[PDB]
Nucleic acid binder design. Structure first.
Ligand SMILES: [Mn+2]
Lengths: 106, 101, 87, 105, 103, 79, 109, 99
DNA sequence: ATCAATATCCACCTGCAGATACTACCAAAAGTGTATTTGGAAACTGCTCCATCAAAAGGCATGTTCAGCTGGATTCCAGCTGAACATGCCTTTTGATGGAGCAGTTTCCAAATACACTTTTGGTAGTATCTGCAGGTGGATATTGAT
DNA sequence: ATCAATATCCACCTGCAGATACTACCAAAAGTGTATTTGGAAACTGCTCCATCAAAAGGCATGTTCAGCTGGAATCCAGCTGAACATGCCTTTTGATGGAGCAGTTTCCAAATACACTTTTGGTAGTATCTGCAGGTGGATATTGAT
């Protein structure tokens, strides 16, 4: 029986372990450590697709693409501050046009 | 007529993504580029969580990172509501792995 | 059988219409005459910047080619981290 | 009868811009042409280091990066004219957007 | 009563003179008590019943103060850009945004 | 007073060092807001460091480790 | 012991201590032999570089001993250090004396 | 007398040394000294770190002295960098020709 | 140009916050010979990937005229703000006690890990057929714009 | 307010690259199980500096009158800047050949690791003179701003 199952997750609980050793972030790795991680990583993955999935239904597409991800990420308070120095590769820009740039008073 | 001087494996999370996808949306696909973005998402969030705990330990003379450091990282590194649910989601996973065997 | 001609003044390959579109998308309305010149320079530094890191990397593990991943470090490490092209 | 300007269609100054401010925003392709933005990633390089070569896909990354930027440097620079009670971007705009960013002094 | 035209330094001059005075000096320009109060009032909401090593509070007072100072030059610059010399909050709001705070 | 504990002249004093001649009236409140944002943000991080080393006291290192990752590094206290 | 690795390189920065700090931090599996020499050297010079200008700075303001104010004035007045500390705040450092030119008496001059 | 003797090791003694090798008559206050000890720690970790990442992209594990060269090269502004690399290749060659 | 009207800047004075000079101190930090371990450097080569061609077109950038109206300059004037002056409360701080709590030290096992098998899997390769939507056409309704 | 004259939605359609799909081997990685090591909680108490007390002292803040001008608003003419319209070029495109130069596998040793063991020294901890300088005093005079 596998350490993913053992913990309930989907994100490779053994594979994140290695990368906590090969990285040399500290010397010794715990037991909760690599588990507790593959939980976060997964959750987030999960978070950002319940968004970029709906993104996709809104414009009648049905396969997620980078651009959907930009709407997702960008239309969302926290993710946005988590990804303030990130750059979504071909993920346009949230539609937006400033006020004083609109033509009126005939 | 197969295989050329064994090419090193480019081990991504492409599959662990797609698996955690179909859960959220059973009938939504994803491109390569759609995807290829998500991998570095994982990849990126890793480096930071680990690394931030790496710091926590070194400000504590700890030669080990426990899931409590990972938590402290997560709690520093993530913004509000994203923090809580991750914190909990994290423990939930530990809880289950310290209740089997 | 090799080619390679002199490479000069290619900042002009960045052209006013396109320096427009960037600025359209920007959410921008009226483009003054100068911006076209000010931006081209503004772009040089950036490239100039990301590149003398992209390379400082390649130059290192003894290579003669700058890779996708090569750039990514030169981005990230400056606070411009891109997802898509790898790592 | 002699009295009625002309007839050829002319869209007012600004209501093609909005039509475009609307459009490029919508999508996602890079607004700089490849070959010409290529020669500049070739060229700025060889000036640091000769005999060097690029990946089909590093120059494709150096784009979406140095692109993105402008369109978001410009984002910041629109904002700035608007703040001088304007609707035109003039070089001084950028230069203020750069300075405050910490790109200058 | 009457004063027979005394001395009243023309406005902005006592201001423009203070600018020179404070740039040349370096001492923390917030009364230490109300600061050490505002520090204690906020952190309580993160953890109740705490302590602050006198250095830590000043460490923060060096940071908080020095932030503001810089942020004020950015404002003034923003302001002068509207062709003004009086910093309104409409200025600050642009400086924070550009820097990426309201962003 | 606390947030009202920071004084209008002190604000004028901190602004003068920035190089400001004319200070509009609203500023004083806006600034007092700007000041709280900063502080809440720092201490939250700092306190999270305290709580890790199991302590009921914020060290001047909790603060550096906080002000560092914030993005506002402070020399003068690090040891 | 016979001769310090510091003086074996000709420095005032502990080419020994570095090598420990580099091992304790977990920067790599294996710190090379040259590594801490180089690293110490490079550090040493930069610290000479500041102090030089930090000495001069005080000598302008009629003083013998160095205060923080002598560092802050040293640093910002120099382009390449300013960038190297482009995002650092020296405690009790103060700021360089500058006033915006539009604020000068009689309109703008 | 080893109780409150948890060593708070620094660079202060080395900072003062170099202080003199250029400005022998000039002093340094404890406050300004601390800054000067914050600085060295700072500049250490960065170069150290930038070299910690530099091994890993290359799939190497040994932080040779080369790593540091680049680490600094990547890190240090224009001219102020050209000098550092030198002084650090100076000291390394001295050590290479040592007892 | 005049000259009071105040804030500024220089030499010269002395006292103490705060840097310096001396010894006793000791764990631990570092250098020194020993014996072992393997990272990475080499030389050879399979092989993906870039420079470079080539030939054909077609959207795309160039320049050009033309004129709408934004930017910039002018005068203006109302009310926000700096100045100054009067109180007068509120910070300062020193000067020093309980007493928390950081921070130190002896314990001791649960937790890491290094150790050698064993089962599994996820990635490349290979080949092979789907299927979502760019993309191109056309015809209905929306926006803009001169009457 | 129509009415023409545009782009703009939206629908239907296709063509096929880019998706998803099985077989297949399979080197590495994941897990299992043991001996073996050890980082850090567990708890006890020593003291360094944190917190409120006390209690002056006046420095520094708050409200108040006055009027100086700075911001903003209201009008007006240059000419900048977009819109459009004619052309024609260089990017784009889709493909094909070296072959440079990257990368993967085999070999071997300089250099780096763990290690037992001798020594140097940086931090501590009082203890005590030293000392540049932060504020005090003239008495100059520069900058300000009335005449
Ligand atoms: Mn060149």
């Amino acid at each position: 029986k596998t350490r993913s199952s053992r913990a309930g997750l989907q994100f490779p609980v053994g594979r994140v372990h290695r990368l906590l050793r090969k990285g040399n972030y500290a010397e010794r790795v715990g037991a909760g450590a690599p588990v507790y991680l593959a939980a976060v990583l997964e959750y987030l993955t999960a978070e950002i697709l319940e968004l970029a999935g709906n993104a996709a239904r809104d414009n009648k597409k049905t396969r997620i693409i980078p651009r959907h991800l930009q709407l997702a990420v960008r239309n969302d308070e926290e993710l946005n501050k988590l990804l303030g120095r990130v750059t979504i590769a071909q993920g346009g820009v949230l539609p937006n046009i400033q006020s004083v740039l609109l033509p009126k008073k005939t | 007529d197969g295989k050329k001087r064994r090419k090193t494996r480019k081990e991504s999370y492409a599959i662990y993504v797609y698996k955690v996808l179909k859960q959220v949306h059973p009938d939504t696909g994803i491109s390569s580029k759609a995807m290829s973005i998500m991998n570095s998402f994982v990849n990126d969030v890793f480096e930071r969580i680990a690394g931030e705990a790496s710091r926590l330990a070194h400000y504590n003379k700890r030669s080990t990172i426990t899931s409590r450091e990972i938590q402290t990282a997560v709690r520093l590194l993530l913004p509000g509501e994203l923090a809580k649910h991750a914190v909990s989601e994290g423990t939930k996973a530990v809880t289950k792995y310290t209740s089997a065997k | 059988k090799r080619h390679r001609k002199v490479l000069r003044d290619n900042i002009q390959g960045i052209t006013k219409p396109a320096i427009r579109r960037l600025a359209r998308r920007g959410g921008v309305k009226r483009i003054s005459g100068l911006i076209y010149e000010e931006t081209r320079g503004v772009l040089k530094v950036f490239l100039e910047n990301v590149i003398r890191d992209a390379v400082t990397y390649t130059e290192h593990a003894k290579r003669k080619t700058v890779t996708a991943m090569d750039v990514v470090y030169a981005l990230k490490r400056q606070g411009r981290t891109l997802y898509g092209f790898g790592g | 009868a002699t009295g009625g300007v002309k007839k050829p269609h002319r869209y007012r100054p600004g209501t093609v811009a909005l039509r475009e401010i609307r459009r490029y925003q919508k999508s996602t392709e890079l607004l700089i042409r490849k070959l010409p933005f290529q020669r500049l990633v070739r060229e700025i390089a060889q000036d640091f280091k000769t005999d060097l070569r690029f990946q089909s896909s590093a120059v494709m990354a150096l784009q979406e990066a140095s692109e993105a930027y402008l369109v978001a440097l410009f984002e910041d620079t629109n904002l700035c004219a608007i703040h001088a009670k304007r609707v035109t971007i003039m070089p001084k705009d950028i230069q203020l957007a750069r300075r405050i960013r910490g790109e200058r002094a």
